Amino acid sequence: SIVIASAARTAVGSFNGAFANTPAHELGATVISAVLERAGVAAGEVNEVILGQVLPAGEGQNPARQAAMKAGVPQEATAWGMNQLCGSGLRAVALGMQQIATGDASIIVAGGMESMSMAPHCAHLRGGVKMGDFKMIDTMIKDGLTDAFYGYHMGTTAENVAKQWQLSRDEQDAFAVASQNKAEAAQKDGRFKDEIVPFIVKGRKGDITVDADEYIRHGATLDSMAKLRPAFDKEGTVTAGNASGLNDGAAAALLMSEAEASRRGIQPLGRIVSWATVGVDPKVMGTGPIPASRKALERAGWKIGDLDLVEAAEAFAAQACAVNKDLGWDPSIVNVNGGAIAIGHPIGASGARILNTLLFEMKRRGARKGLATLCIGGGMGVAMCIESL
Amino acid sequence: SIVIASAARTAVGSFNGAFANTPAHELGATVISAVLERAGVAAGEVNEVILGQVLPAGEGQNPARQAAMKAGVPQEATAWGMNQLCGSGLRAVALGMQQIATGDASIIVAGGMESMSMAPHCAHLRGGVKMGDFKMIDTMIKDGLTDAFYGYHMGTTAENVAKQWQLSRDEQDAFAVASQNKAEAAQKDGRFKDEIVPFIVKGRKGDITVDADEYIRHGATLDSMAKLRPAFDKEGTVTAGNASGLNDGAAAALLMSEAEASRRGIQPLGRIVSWATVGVDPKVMGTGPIPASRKALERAGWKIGDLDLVEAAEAFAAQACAVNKDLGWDPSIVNVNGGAIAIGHPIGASGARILNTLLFEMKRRGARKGLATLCIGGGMGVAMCIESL
Amino acid sequence: SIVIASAARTAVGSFNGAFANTPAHELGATVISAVLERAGVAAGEVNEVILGQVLPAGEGQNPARQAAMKAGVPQEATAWGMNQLCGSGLRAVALGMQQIATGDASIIVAGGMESMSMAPHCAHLRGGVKMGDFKMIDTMIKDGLTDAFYGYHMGTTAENVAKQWQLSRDEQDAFAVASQNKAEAAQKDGRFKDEIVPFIVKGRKGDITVDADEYIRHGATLDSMAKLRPAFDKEGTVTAGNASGLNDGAAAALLMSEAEASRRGIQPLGRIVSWATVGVDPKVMGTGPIPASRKALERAGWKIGDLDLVEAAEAFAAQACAVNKDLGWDPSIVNVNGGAIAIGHPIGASGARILNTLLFEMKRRGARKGLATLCIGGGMGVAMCIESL
Amino acid sequence: SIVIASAARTAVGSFNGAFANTPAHELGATVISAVLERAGVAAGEVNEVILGQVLPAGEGQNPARQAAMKAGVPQEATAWGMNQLCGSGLRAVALGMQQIATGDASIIVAGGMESMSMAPHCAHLRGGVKMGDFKMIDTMIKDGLTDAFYGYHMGTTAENVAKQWQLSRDEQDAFAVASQNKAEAAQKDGRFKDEIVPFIVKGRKGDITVDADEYIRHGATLDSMAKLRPAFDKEGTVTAGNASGLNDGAAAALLMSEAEASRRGIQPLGRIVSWATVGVDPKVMGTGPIPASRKALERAGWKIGDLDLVEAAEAFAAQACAVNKDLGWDPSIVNVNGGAIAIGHPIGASGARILNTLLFEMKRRGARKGLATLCIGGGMGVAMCIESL
Ligand SMILES: CC(C)(COP(=O)(O)OP(=O)(O)OC[C@H]1O[C@@H](n2cnc3c(N)ncnc32)[C@@H](O)[C@@H]1OP(=O)(O)O)[C@@H](O)C(=O)NCCC(=O)NCCS
Ligand SMILES: CC(C)(COP(=O)(O)OP(=O)(O)OC[C@H]1O[C@@H](n2cnc3c(N)ncnc32)[C@@H](O)[C@H]1OP(=O)(O)O)[C@@H](O)C(=O)NCCC(=O)NCCS
Ligand SMILES: CC(C)(COP(=O)(O)OP(=O)(O)OC[C@H]1O[C@@H](n2cnc3c(N)ncnc32)[C@H](O)[C@@H]1OP(=O)(O)O)[C@@H](O)C(=O)NCCC(=O)NCCS
Ligand SMILES: CC(C)(COP(=O)(O)OP(=O)(O)OC[C@H]1O[C@H](n2cnc3c(N)ncnc32)[C@@H](O)[C@@H]1OP(=O)(O)O)[C@@H](O)C(=O)NCCC(=O)NCCS
Ligand SMILES: [Cl-]
Ligand SMILES: [K+]
Ligand code: NA
């Protein structure tokens, strides 16, 4: 019933990098405009914008609405944001699909956006501090990256998974270098061009056009990777090199019914066949994609062997490894263009980011059946199955 | 099709009052346990928790999940939060309904939660401040209450509406006093007892049980109301007395199919027959409820005259007056137990809070057809139609 | 040769009390006017104002200039502040004396002022905080009360003195009670009436005359004293009850040669016959007064027995007892009207504050030779000998 | 009878440059050790260290005693800071001279130190902030650079003087260019080598040695000067180019009796023949050096024409010209190696910084009489006369 008419994403910016001072909703507005243009659909026609966003503090009322309004979506339309952590960008898409499935809207723009760079530090001060030092809390770390039940970083959950799965530092680094090497090759061959829409960072002393993923290392070496220190555990195995990055970006999709696309003469990027979300132990959250992907497949009536292409989000080499090992899908069809270790990981946006990557590679290679999945802090996974028209 | 098996709310707390240092997820956890207990449904049976929440900064990863885990919802379930401003707690319920209608879940807990007291001040400090003072932003004011497009308070949107609809200060005050007087009578008669679940405020030198709405003023006088100064515009008409408050609380509902409740022998509080959300001009966001309620009724196939009871959220006397004038429903059936001017207005929670009040009043008086609606910052409304079974 | 024509001091306020919102320089201005008025000297005759002050953060350029100008001292005069911690208030008078003695000035106003209540929290943010929590530092504690070499509170240095002089908890409670009793006694006997000059705390909702030492607790008994738990060590001896308080206040003296006073027909509160500052171990900083006292005494060619009146700052019961035991002077002429434990310890002003008490008490009882001394954090002491004329 | 036995200063750092993260007392300790070494005096011989410093917030108890201790001065000695704003560094030396003059001390180290980089932002937060944004105040701007009575920047007092004296933009620019060219020439020709002691910036990623003033622009031209826009007044004359800079550094002098130096075989840098400080209207604070220099010269018995060399702090091209214009001393003997416009102006150290430049230049050219002077925010001036031996 529901198709993805069009998709777009910004380049992913490095932490305090190209988009260091760019509010998330500015990134979202550009991707909203882009999917409308790519589909031949006027902003006037949008019913609702649904944007995942984990870190909106200090951005002002409902950044999803600010994005939609900046893109010229009409005031009569609606907008909201949601948060299921790193599952957000993809969940928003399944949520958008449900609005159409129940007959409550016809045209939805859904995805995610995140500025981890603009995330502020904070403190509750209404009571006052009579005496003594107090903490200014980094919201990115606190609200984005720390498990609320165990008090440790997502990177520690990665350690937990490495131990349970017995994944050596050497195995994790090999994975990491492959991801970098795949992404470099894809960037250089122009495989990210179709999906990226440029973003203009307005500057008094010059406007800069950002249209490439700046986090991707060129010529990353295993030796330099092997050299790194463990980032979360002195005798750990997870490093800055084999973990995903802290990043900025947005990414979205334009949804409507298959019949509606047909009337408009649009050739959709894909049909949404199923999605699923399941929970797992917070301590091993990186394992979420396993039950999530298996449920999505079952809902699709598909076998793992039926898939032609897969984007499994690389939160950490440790967890991506475990996911691939348990699901057992051919690794040669997974993250064919590199993943988050190389490309970066703007949390609320990431699920829509890999959806864009999946859809455009499926189109270019003629892949019929695909799946995107991500792990979720606090212990969850989300997955979505996509079939080509 | 989808019914509300059961519902519950905490007392609504005064700003920096009874829940001054209570994080929202703790209020949510209590309300999740209550809906479960009231339906006879075990926590193990819940598929997903969905909580509207506008101000989660500093609380940690995905407070919805924290609330759910604290209530004993199993790790295999999921949880997410969402943000459609004051519409959130009600939109969360419509979203929960869609999970079931599309066959993606069987049992949902849905509502909202908010601690405006615990909302922090923040600043973006990653780039440093080379020189010059800078602002520590109040997230409640900034992210909750300020219009992102015009830069003025929701109270200014209320002024715009009062000007446009030509509602005197005296008229707004009379509405305000009536709200207070209806709320006091309802409290004293015990009409809020069904819907409220007590919350134990843990204290080092004494736990305190909060089970009454503390913001409700006893013996409110028109003369005291009339002596207040305009709170947003020196020659304005909107005052602290005829505006909603800044408050804390949570409220939820347990959702399942009609056939599911029947299998379980559950007598539902009601059937969700339609909902709607529509946009309007940010400048007069308080008019949100007009097109939303009309759309909801049309979808329900109901005339305005078909309604037996209505809860229209009182963000400001000014806009609540405008809403009633335009829709023309019998004002004697609207907020019969008072509303937000008296009871309070914890943003994320408010939509579920008025849903609770509607359901328990509908049950108590044998009302067949109900509607709940709220205005939303940035120019939106949401409304839901409920029929008794 | 150099005399103190006149002296005055504010009442000493409790922490976040009478002066919770009053900037030190306002308190300075009141005291400057009082010494002029009391000596019958025009402000235009002041060459320079010198004010000790440890916690100026946030008050604007050179608070001593601000105080001087508010007090009426014309623009032609000069002003500056100085910091020798708790010695400041007294040191400033020594410095003032030195201006005249070298023939560089004729008339000085010198003393100290401090608002520990108005001391702000701070952080260095120019380079930015890239990631992670940081601390907002209480300047009162950091710059005021923490030893910069060992990193602990002045309370620990007193604990240090407690264990070296083997002073028992009860032996410090005894000292604490007797100070309180004496303080209450002088107060009710009206012995602080002369030195004190009232301060008017302006206000929107009222004006308040502050003319009483509010930190003095009346009816002090040993019972409550010995029921306090240690303040700096889980099983130490120093407590809130036997250490000085946190307080606001200002105090000052008017200086000029003995000839000048004569020409103006002024009867001086006394003559400064010597002064001294010496250093000691930072760990046992409370001992400071021992060497500075002997130095000043030796410089004046007096013996300890020559003294008729002594003011020895009560930073802590521990250090005060230690100094009194080491010096061997008669415990019945020391802090006759009680000390800082009962009166308050406004760091920057304390040395001038105790100088006032000394001066007015000497005059009242007909004492000939007098001494004021204070210990200083970082390991220093300062002392001054005063003779009646 | 007081002589400057020796002197030293760090290189002056650019704002957030070489010493971006270097606490003032560290620079202070280096300069203290240096003057000890240069004079051949043992640290254990130092009675007191006196350091001017305007922005100490968050550096802990009495940064001056920190410097003295780190520098190796024994706990037995004393130390304190003082604030006469821009004149602090030179006033310190005059105060140390008085210590010896009155026989209270034999050997003093006096000067000043400032880290405008490390100055923090602050907020008074003890009462708490119930709601609303609040200001985090830049202490550098607030306590250092803003007139407490008029609320505007020193740059505005500068305009006042410029308009008062009718000094054209071009004129101020011509002065700016000279000061840079003079400093560049002095730097390259080795003229700063004597006075500067190198400072080692300790660093994880390596140590860096700083021994050159990094703020001096090489090849400054009238062309570049002209292109700059007004820094404070939209139709003003003062720009970043003809105004002094924000900077870090420290400077000091070892003081002793002339007979003591002769006992030691020391050939002092000069004899302090007089000093003076005077007030003026804060609005035109930049005029301060006029009365100060004239009073100093009068106290010295010197005609203006007796001077062989002059250091007159270049707070602004505006006030500098004015001062020079009034006094009428030969311009070719004024700031011969450049001034603060090029070298930098580390507030509390500045007066000791220009004292170093003067002393060392007086020696290499055989100058007999010299004068140093600076303006002071809040409307004061200070000056000192030096005579070679
Ligand atoms: C004047 C002042 C406000 C400007 O501060 P600032 O703008 O942060 O410093 P900058 O040098 O970066 O000024 C901006 C620009 O002018 C420049 N500039 C300054 N002098 C220049 C020159 N002689 N030639 C060419 N460019 C010059 C640039 O370096 C610069 O360009 P950029 O912004 O692209 O980097 C500041 O230095 C100050 O307040 N000075 C006075 C301090 C004081 O009052 N002390 C006490 C007085 S008694
Ligand atoms: C000692 C010190 C740490 C305590 O400050 P504080 O504990 O925050 O002050 P409080 O308002 O909390 O009062 C302290 C507590 O003991 C009490 N108390 C203190 N003296 C008491 C007495 N004489 N009798 C009965 N109770 C007493 C209580 O009032 C109690 O608070 P409560 O109401 O919760 O029971 C503080 O005053 C200080 O730092 N003193 C030293 C200052 C200094 O070092 N200056 C320079 C010296 S070199
Ligand atoms: C309206 C608002 C600004 C007022 O906040 P506030 O004035 O700071 O809070 P208060 O309740 O303490 O009001 C202050 C005063 O009016 C009084 N007051 C309020 N209602 C009164 C009444 N019905 N009768 C008599 N006095 C009343 C107080 O008791 C009080 O007296 P005081 O100043 O001597 O203490 C604030 O509640 C607000 O922002 N509400 C709107 C929130 C909103 O927009 N939500 C979403 C909309 S889509
Ligand atoms: C792991 C993490 C803490 C590190 O961030 P960071 O400390 O800023 O690391 P950086 O990118 O600045 O790089 C650090 C060092 O290793 C680097 N490095 C990183 N990858 C490298 C590589 N592949 N090869 C060589 N060096 C590499 C260096 O550039 C650097 O050295 P230097 O800066 O001292 O000169 C951070 O990226 C993070 O938290 N990632 C996980 C986020 C996450 O949990 N998201 C969601 C999961 S559900
Ligand atoms: Cl979101
Ligand atoms: K959000
Ligand atoms: Na010093």
Question: What does it look like?
Answer:
Chains A, B, C, D: This is Acetyl-CoA acetyltransferase. Chains A, B, C, D: Belongs to the thiolase-like superfamily. Thiolase family. Chains A, B, C, D: Its EC number is 2.3.1.9. The complex is a heterotetramer, with three copies of chain A (389 residues) and one copy of chain D (389 residues). Chain A has 389 residues and is an alpha+beta fold. Chain A starts with a strand and ends with a strand. The longest helix of chain A is centred in the middle third of the chain and has 21 residues. Chain A is built from twelve helices and 14 strands. In chain A, the strands form three sheets. In chain A, strands 1, 2, 3, 4, 5, 10, 11, 12, 13 and 14 form a ten-stranded mixed sheet that branches. In chain A, strands 6-7 form a two-stranded antiparallel ribbon. Chain A has two domains: 203 residues, Thiolase/Chalcone synthase (Peroxisomal Thiolase, Chain A, domain 1); 156 residues, Thiolase/Chalcone synthase (Peroxisomal Thiolase, Chain A, domain 1). In chain D, α3 crosses α12. Chain D folds into two domains: 203 residues, Peroxisomal Thiolase, Chain A, domain 1; 156 residues, Peroxisomal Thiolase, Chain A, domain 1 (3-Layer(aba) Sandwich). Chain D starts with a strand and ends with a strand. With 389 residues, chain D is of the alpha+beta class. At the A-B interface, α2, β4, α3, β6 and α4 of A face α2, β4, α3, β6 and α4 of B. β4 of chain A pairs antiparallel with β4 of chain B.
Brief summary of the model shown:
The complex is a heterotetramer, with 3 copies of chain A (about 400 residues) and 1 copy of chain D (about 400 residues). Chain A has helices at about 25-40, 65-70, 90-100, 140-145, 155-165, 170-190, 220-225, 260-265, 290-300, 315-325, 340-345, 350-365; strands spanning about 1-10, 15, 50, 80-85, 110-115, 120-125, 135-140, 200, 210, 245-255, 270-280, 310, 370-375, 380-385.
